[PDB]
Amino acid sequence: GLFDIIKKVASVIGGL
Amino acid sequence: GLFDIIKKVASVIGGL
Amino acid sequence: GLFDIIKKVASVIGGL
Amino acid sequence: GLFDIIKKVASVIGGL
Amino acid sequence: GLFDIIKKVASVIGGL
Amino acid sequence: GLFDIIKKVASVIGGL
Amino acid sequence: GLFDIIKKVASVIGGL
Amino acid sequence: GLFDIIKKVASVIGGL
Amino acid sequence: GLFDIIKKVASVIGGL
């Protein structure tokens, strides 16, 4: 039982 | 039992 | 039981 | 009477 | 009577 | 009568 | 004789 | 004779 | 003879 919401985000990823 | 919200965010990731 | 909210944020990650 | 010029721009909007 | 020029700009908006 | 010029700028907005 | 490798990069250019 | 490696990078360029 | 490595970096350039 978990709730997760990722919303209205923008990113410039130099890593990963 | 957990609630997580990540909202209206932006980033320039040099690490990772 | 936990609530987490990350909201209206920006960062320039030099470490990680 | 007004002049407006938005030129050579790029952005990563976390808000709005 | 006004003149506005926004030129050669970039941003990572965490607010708004 | 006003002149405004915003030129060659960058920012990482934590407030707003 | 030179070696050049540009790898896994992303950018938001306000200039140029 | 030179070796150059630009790796896992990101930037928000206000100048240039 | 030279070796150069620019790695896991981020920046917000206000000058240049």
Task: Describe the structure in your own words.
9 copies of one chain form a homononamer. The first copy, chain A, has strands at 2-7, 10-13. Chain A is elongated, with a radius of gyration of 12 Å. The relative contact order of chain A is 0.19. Chain A is mainly beta. The A-B interface holds A 1-16 and B 1-16. Strand 1 of chain B pairs parallel with strand 1 of chain C. Chains A, B, C, D, E, F, G, H, I: InterPro entries: Aurein_antimicrobial_peptide (IPR013157). Chains A, B, C, D, E, F, G, H, I: Bacteriostatic action for Gram-positive bacteria.
Keywords:
homononamer; 16 residues; 2 strands; elongated
In short, what is this structure?
Nine copies of one chain form a homononamer. Chain A has 16 residues and is mostly beta strands.
Q: Can you lay out the helices and strands and say which pair or pack?
A:
The structure is a homononamer of 16-residue chains.
Chain A: E1 2-7, E2 10-13
PDB class: antimicrobial protein
Keywords: Amyloid Helical, antimicrobial protein
Assembly: nonameric
The biggest sheet of chain A amounts to: none
Shape assignment of chain A = elongated
Helix content of chain A: under 10%
Count of DSSP helices of chain A? 0
What sequence of helices (H) and strands (E) makes up the elements of chain A? EE
